[PDB]
Amino acid sequence: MKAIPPKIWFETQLKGSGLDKKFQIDELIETQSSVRVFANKKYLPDTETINEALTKVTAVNVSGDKSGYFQNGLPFPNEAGYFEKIPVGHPELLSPIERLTGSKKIVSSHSLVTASGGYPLTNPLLPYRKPIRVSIFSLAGPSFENNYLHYRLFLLDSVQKIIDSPLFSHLHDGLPIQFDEAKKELGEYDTNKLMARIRLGFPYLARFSSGGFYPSFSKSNAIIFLSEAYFRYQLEDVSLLLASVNQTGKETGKAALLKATAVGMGFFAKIDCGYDIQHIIFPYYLRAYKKLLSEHKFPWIAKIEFPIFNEIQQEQFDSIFEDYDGPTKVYRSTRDVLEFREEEIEKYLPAAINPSDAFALTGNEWGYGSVESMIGNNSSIRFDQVHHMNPLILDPSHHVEAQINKDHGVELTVN
Numbered sequence: 541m542k543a544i545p546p547k548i549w550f551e552t553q554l555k556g557s558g559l560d561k562k563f564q565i566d567e568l569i570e571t572q573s574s575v576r577v578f579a580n581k582k583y584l585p586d587t588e589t590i591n592e593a594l595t596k597v598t599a600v601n602v603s604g605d606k607s608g609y610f611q612n613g614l615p616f617p618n619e620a621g622y623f624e625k626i627p628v629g630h631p632e633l634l635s636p637i638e639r640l641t642g643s644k645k646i647v648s649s650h651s652l653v654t655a656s657g658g659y660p661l662t663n664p665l666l667p668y669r670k671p672i673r674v675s676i677f678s679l680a681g682p683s684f685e686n687n688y689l690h691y692r693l694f695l696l697d698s699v700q701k702i703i704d705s706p707l708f709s710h711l712h713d714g715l716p717i718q719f720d721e722a723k724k725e726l727g728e729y730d731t732n733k734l735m736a737r738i739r740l741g742f743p744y745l746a747r748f749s750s751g752g753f754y755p756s757f758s759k760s761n762a763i764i765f766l767s768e769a770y771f772r773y774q775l776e777d778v779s780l781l782l783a784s785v786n787q788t789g790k791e792t793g794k795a796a797l798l799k800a801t802a803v804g805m806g807f808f809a810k811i812d813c814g815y816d817i818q819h820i821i822f823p824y825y826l827r828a829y830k831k832l833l834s835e836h837k838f839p840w841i842a843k844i845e846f847p848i849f850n851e852i853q854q855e856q857f858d859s860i861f862e863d864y865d866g867p868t869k870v871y872r873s874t875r876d877v878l879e880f881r882e883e884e885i886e887k888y889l890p891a892a893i894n895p896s897d898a899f900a901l902t903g904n905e906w907g908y909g910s911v912e913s914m915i916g917n918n919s920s921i922r923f924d925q926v927h928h929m930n931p932l933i934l935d936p937s938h939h940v941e942a943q944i945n946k947d948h949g950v951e952l953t954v955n
């Protein structure tokens with residue numbers, strides 16, 4: 541098996557997919573032109589930092605680095621821990637920490653969309669009579685699929701007994717940092733105002749200092765979830781997103797109908813790939829929207845529709861927003877992220893979150909294996925948001941620097 545050149549490899553998948561044949565050149569000039577990269581200053585300070593996060597990635601990646609392909613087309617090795625051991629400054633690939641910081645960007649494009657649906661298998665693929673254009677905002681939520689990404693920010697266990705993470709210090713300011721000190725501040729109790737133990741149903745989630753999770757009854761090896769750190773992280777992600785979408789609404793003179801996909805609540809929510817913690821983290825994702833929308837004016841966001849299909853999240857959403865009277869209209873649906881009506885497309889900017897991967901090319905899998913891959917097959921995003929096809933994504937002209945204040949207001953600087 542011979543490594544083929546990355547750009548040629550990509551163009552091959554495009555012809556095998558039939559995506560090369562779905563759009564005309566005149567439109568793709570427009571969609572590719574509309575690409576923007578909203579980067580958080582604190583983590584992506586330079587044009588060099590940004591372009592590295594956009595490019596030093598695998599082509600296809602699932603199961604938290606267990607399976608996939610590099611950009612040259614070759615499969616992932618069989619040595620486990622390979623990607624855990626990628627160092628900062630590797631010639632071609634992001635380290636774990638660079639994957640955490642590289643997550644603090646949003647890549648948008650006003651992309652053509654030819655169908656809605658296709659994932660999951662129960663959600664039928666529906667062609668649009670005429671292709672519409674949706675402003676697709678790619679954001680990589682926290683991943684918990686392995687133990688060396690956002691696990692090391694938000695969980696305390698006796699294997700990595702304390703966090704140890706500069707450049708993310710602010711997330712823990714006031715919060716405990718060591719496991720057994722964390723045990724003792726909680727003492728007799730399971731939750732406090734900054735952290736909580738995890739229970740999927742009735743028993744607790746614990747990790748052997750071997751490595752390996754098991755259901756023990758909150759004894760010495762019960763893991764503790766750093767709730768407040770996670771919420772502070774979400775406020776950064778959601779701040780950036782609302783600002784990005786607002787600024788795009790303004791620049792097009794239309795208010796957005798934003799499809800607020802449940803970023804992070806699917807594959808990324810399964811510790812290892814078995815233990816679903818979605819029911820624990822989703823409230824903080826919603827409260828991030830609640831707090832920011834209550835505290836800031838977004839004249840260019842008409843509505844935010846939350847696609848929510850799970851009974852728990854539906855009741856969680858109704859709880860968290862019962863109280864909410866911010867100006868921006870908020871509501872939940874069971875409508876596919878990419879499905880809009882004609883009336884909605886005429887009145888508003890159609891906007892959607894692409895729940896993406898900070899360590900694979902935009903679109904990721906080429907089947908209908910995820911929300912992103914589904915978007916990857918129903919739109920021009922693989923043309924608009926992949927440097928192999930659209931080098932404008934590496935142009936500093938197309939970058940937007942974002943500063944997030946202590947009030948979480950965001951100042952956007954073109955160049």
Ligand SMILES: Nc1ncnc2c1ncn2[C@@H]1O[C@H](COP(=O)(O)OP(=O)(O)OC[C@H]2O[C@H](O)[C@H](O)[C@@H]2O)[C@@H](O)[C@H]1O
Pocket residue numbers: 601602657659660663681801802803804805806807808809847848849875876877878895896897900903904905909910911912913
């Ligand atoms: N048709 C749909 N429309 C809108 N929302 C949906 C739909 N289907 C599911 N959801 C909701 O969207 C939520 C998350 O869907 P996921 O695809 O797992 O996104 P992630 O952020 O957890 O994982 C990102 C990784 O997975 C990809 O491979 C990336 O390349 C990354 O590798 C689901 O739980 C549903 O509630």
